[PDB]
Nucleic acid binder design. Structure first.
Ligand SMILES: Nc1nc2c([nH]c(=O)n2[C@H]2C[C@H](O)[C@@H](COP(=O)(O)OP(=O)(O)OP(=O)(O)O)O2)c(=O)[nH]1
Ligand SMILES: [Mn+2]
Ligand SMILES: [Mn+2]
Ligand SMILES: [Mn+2]
Ligand SMILES: [Mn+2]
Ligand SMILES: [Mn+2]
Ligand code: NA
Ligand code: NA
Length: 310
DNA sequence: CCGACCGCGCATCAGC
DNA sequence: GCTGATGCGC
DNA sequence: GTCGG
């Protein structure tokens, strides 16, 4: 937490711009600043020192001056005290409720966790589940449960087909000691860039009562809720089915971080390449046989999953 | 000063 | 009933 | 909000 005070402040600003202002690029601006400062090896003594960093500019430096000076920020205090603002900010904590629905609930006087409970009729399936597990979803997941979870999924997959390969990605693959959720990258030989595979994995995981609820489900992505058997908290899980011959782009994507992916895909465009969770193109998909192969194509040195937490 | 700022899967519902 | 526009989230 | 064109 070298500069935690400042990165905490910037993260709150970001959240406000996203949820309340609905200014996604300001959100991204503040998270880049926060990200860049988070990897700064020195304790920031002024805004001027901070301003030297790319992503940090005039408006942020002045804010850092005020925070190092007054120990707080006036803009934030103002925002925390505004009813509409704080209300919207709070509702977005519910899975399925974004800036638009939050704002619209608040306009009709629905601003608390209780108000949503007495208005179930006005939530879609996804929001209801977000409300139902509101508390549980804000709880972190210890790697000890992640390992357990990893084992219940990998083995339930073998039990559908031995050629299925399930790889747990996300914060877990980065080596985090706790994770927001569980992300599973799934492949199988009968599915490539050339021509009910996920349904089968979802069904099986449902029968053994690991998957308790469904938020969204298509032919390549599943988002739902899972739970270790006996009571543990309910947890978020996402499964992504990726063409076997695109494992490495997929696993690079699904490993993150979200900020790292945005950094990498941008630097990609600099060097003349476009990256998605499937291919890296110039253009036709270039040949890839490892994650590193991707870091080569774009003249950025390789970095172990543990060193991708942007 | 202006304005671009990664890439994509699934669900909902206003407006026909 | 249908389907883009839009929303939400990875 | 930021930075590069
Ligand atoms: N291109 C792109 N990739 C993203 C974005 N957001 C995002 O999470 N990803 C990728 C990187 C993440 O590791 C992966 C899974 O998302 P996640 O919500 O489970 O986050 P996470 O595993 O890194 O962290 P955690 O909070 O669950 O512990 O999706 C985004 O906005 N753009
Ligand atoms: Mn995750
Ligand atoms: Mn996830
Ligand atoms: Mn401007
Ligand atoms: Mn459609
Ligand atoms: Mn996330
Ligand atoms: Na700067
Ligand atoms: Na939300």
């Amino acid at each position: 937490t070298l500069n935690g005070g400042i990165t905490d402040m910037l993260t709150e600003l970001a959240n406000f711009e996203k949820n309340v202002s609905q200014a996604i690029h300001k959100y991204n601006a503040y998270r880049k600043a926060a990200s860049v400062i988070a990897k700064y090896p020195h304790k920031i003594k002024s805004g001027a020192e901070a301003k030297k960093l790319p992503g940090v500019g005039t408006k942020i430096a002045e804010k850092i001056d005020e925070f190092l000076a007054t120990g707080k920020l006036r803009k934030l205090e103002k925002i925390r005290q505004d009813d509409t603002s704080s209300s919207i900010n709070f509702l977005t904590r519910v899975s399925g409720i974004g800036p638009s629905a939050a704002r619209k609930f608040v306009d009709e006087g629905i601003k608390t966790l209780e108000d949503l409970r007495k208005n179930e009729d006005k939530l879609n399936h996804h929001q209801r589940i977000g409300l139902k597990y509101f508390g549980d979803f804000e709880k972190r997941i210890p790697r000890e449960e992640m390992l357990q979870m990893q084992d219940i999924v990998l083995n339930e997959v073998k039990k559908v087909d031995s050629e299925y390969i399930a790889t747990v990605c996300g914060s877990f693959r980065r080596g985090a000691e706790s994770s927001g959720d569980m992300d599973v990258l799934l492949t199988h030989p009968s599915f490539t860039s050339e021509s009910k595979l996920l349904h089968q994995v979802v069904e099986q995981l449902q029968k053994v009562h690991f998957i308790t609820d469904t938020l969204s489900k298509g032919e390549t992505k599943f988002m739902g809720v899972c739970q270790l058997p006996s009571e543990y908290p309910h947890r978020r899980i996402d499964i992504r089915l990726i063409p076997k011959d695109q494992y490495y782009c997929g696993v690079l994507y699904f490993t993150g971080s979200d900020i790292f992916n945005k950094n990498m895909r941008a630097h990609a465009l600099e060097k003349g390449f476009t990256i998605n969770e499937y291919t890296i193109r110039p253009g036709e998909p270039l040949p890839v046989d490892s994650e590193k192969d991707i870091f080569d194509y774009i003249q950025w040195k390789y970095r172990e999953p543990k060193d991708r937490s942007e």
